[PDB]
Amino acid sequence: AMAQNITARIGEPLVLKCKGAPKKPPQRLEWKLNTGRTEAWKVLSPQGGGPWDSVARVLPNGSLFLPAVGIQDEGIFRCQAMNRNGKETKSNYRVRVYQIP
């Protein structure tokens, strides 16, 4: 149980790198985040996109960029992976916007 303290501004673009994929070819990957209501949690795939794809995309280097991080983006983000044996990456980042409700 942990989390990194990161300050952000509402409507301001933010970029972060979420490594994890070993040296082997592009393996599976799953996106998960814990929040009060949770409305950003989306399923990321190496071949396909969803709704969150329009809200935020992943760079070829395994990064993450958001056009404008708002209150909905608040909360804590977490990365995870799925290998043949079931290997997952543990990491939680705490993100908060300037003006809050």
Short mmCIF file of C-alpha atoms in Angstrom, two decimals:
data_model
loop_
_atom_site.label_atom_id
_atom_site.label_comp_id
_atom_site.label_asym_id
_atom_site.label_seq_id
_atom_site.Cartn_x
_atom_site.Cartn_y
_atom_site.Cartn_z
CA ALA A 1 0.00 0.00 0.00
CA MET A 2 1.74 3.13 -1.29
CA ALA A 3 1.46 6.05 -3.71
CA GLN A 4 3.56 8.87 -5.15
CA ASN A 5 2.56 12.48 -4.46
CA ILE A 6 2.24 14.36 -7.75
CA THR A 7 0.73 17.83 -8.17
CA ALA A 8 -1.14 18.77 -11.33
CA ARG A 9 -3.34 21.55 -12.71
CA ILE A 10 -6.88 21.09 -14.04
CA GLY A 11 -7.04 21.24 -17.83
CA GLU A 12 -3.24 21.14 -18.01
CA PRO A 13 -1.46 18.54 -20.23
CA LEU A 14 0.60 15.91 -18.41
CA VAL A 15 2.99 13.21 -19.62
CA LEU A 16 4.26 10.18 -17.70
CA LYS A 17 6.19 6.99 -18.45
CA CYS A 18 4.84 3.64 -17.25
CA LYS A 19 7.39 0.96 -18.16
CA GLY A 20 6.92 -2.73 -17.44
CA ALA A 21 7.06 -4.58 -20.75
CA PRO A 22 10.17 -6.84 -20.64
CA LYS A 23 12.63 -7.18 -23.53
CA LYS A 24 10.34 -9.72 -25.19
CA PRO A 25 7.84 -8.65 -27.92
CA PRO A 26 4.80 -6.48 -27.03
CA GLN A 27 2.98 -8.56 -24.42
CA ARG A 28 -0.46 -8.08 -22.87
CA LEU A 29 -1.26 -5.09 -20.65
CA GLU A 30 -4.08 -3.96 -18.37
CA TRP A 31 -4.87 -0.51 -16.98
CA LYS A 32 -6.29 -0.11 -13.47
CA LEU A 33 -6.81 2.83 -11.11
CA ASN A 34 -8.37 3.34 -7.69
CA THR A 35 -10.51 6.41 -7.01
CA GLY A 36 -13.64 7.60 -5.24
CA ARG A 37 -15.96 7.08 -8.19
CA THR A 38 -13.48 5.86 -10.81
CA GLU A 39 -14.38 7.03 -14.31
CA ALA A 40 -11.04 6.78 -16.12
CA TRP A 41 -10.23 3.08 -15.68
CA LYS A 42 -9.94 1.65 -19.21
CA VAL A 43 -8.66 -1.59 -20.73
CA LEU A 44 -5.54 -1.06 -22.85
CA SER A 45 -4.64 -3.56 -25.58
CA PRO A 46 -1.62 -3.91 -27.93
CA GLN A 47 -4.07 -4.03 -30.84
CA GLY A 48 -7.17 -1.90 -30.28
CA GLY A 49 -8.61 1.14 -28.55
CA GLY A 50 -11.57 2.27 -26.49
CA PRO A 51 -13.18 5.41 -24.98
CA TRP A 52 -10.23 6.37 -22.78
CA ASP A 53 -8.17 6.29 -25.98
CA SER A 54 -9.61 9.71 -26.82
CA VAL A 55 -8.94 10.98 -23.30
CA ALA A 56 -5.36 9.70 -23.20
CA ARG A 57 -3.00 7.68 -25.39
CA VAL A 58 0.15 5.61 -24.83
CA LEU A 59 3.42 6.47 -26.56
CA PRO A 60 5.34 3.73 -28.45
CA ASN A 61 7.86 3.91 -25.61
CA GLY A 62 5.15 2.91 -23.14
CA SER A 63 4.29 6.40 -21.93
CA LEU A 64 1.07 8.30 -21.25
CA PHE A 65 -0.03 11.77 -22.33
CA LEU A 66 -3.27 13.59 -21.51
CA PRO A 67 -4.56 16.58 -23.57
CA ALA A 68 -5.84 18.13 -20.34
CA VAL A 69 -5.85 16.55 -16.88
CA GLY A 70 -8.98 17.60 -15.01
CA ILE A 71 -10.87 16.61 -11.87
CA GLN A 72 -11.96 13.37 -13.54
CA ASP A 73 -8.30 12.46 -14.01
CA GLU A 74 -7.70 12.96 -10.27
CA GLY A 75 -7.20 10.00 -7.98
CA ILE A 76 -4.48 7.35 -8.20
CA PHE A 77 -3.27 5.59 -11.34
CA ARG A 78 -1.81 2.08 -11.48
CA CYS A 79 -0.07 -0.02 -14.13
CA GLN A 80 -0.24 -3.78 -14.64
CA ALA A 81 0.88 -6.47 -17.08
CA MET A 82 -0.04 -10.08 -17.85
CA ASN A 83 2.56 -12.63 -18.95
CA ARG A 84 2.34 -16.34 -19.76
CA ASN A 85 2.91 -17.15 -16.09
CA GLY A 86 0.90 -14.21 -14.77
CA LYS A 87 3.45 -11.49 -14.09
CA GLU A 88 2.02 -8.11 -13.09
CA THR A 89 3.67 -4.77 -12.31
CA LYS A 90 2.82 -2.99 -9.05
CA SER A 91 2.91 0.81 -9.02
CA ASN A 92 0.51 3.49 -7.77
CA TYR A 93 0.82 7.20 -8.56
CA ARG A 94 -1.17 9.79 -6.62
CA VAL A 95 -2.45 12.62 -8.82
CA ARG A 96 -4.39 15.70 -7.71
CA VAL A 97 -5.58 18.85 -9.47
CA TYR A 98 -5.28 22.45 -8.28
CA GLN A 99 -8.94 23.32 -7.64
CA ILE A 100 -10.91 20.49 -6.03
CA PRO A 101 -14.63 20.01 -5.22
#
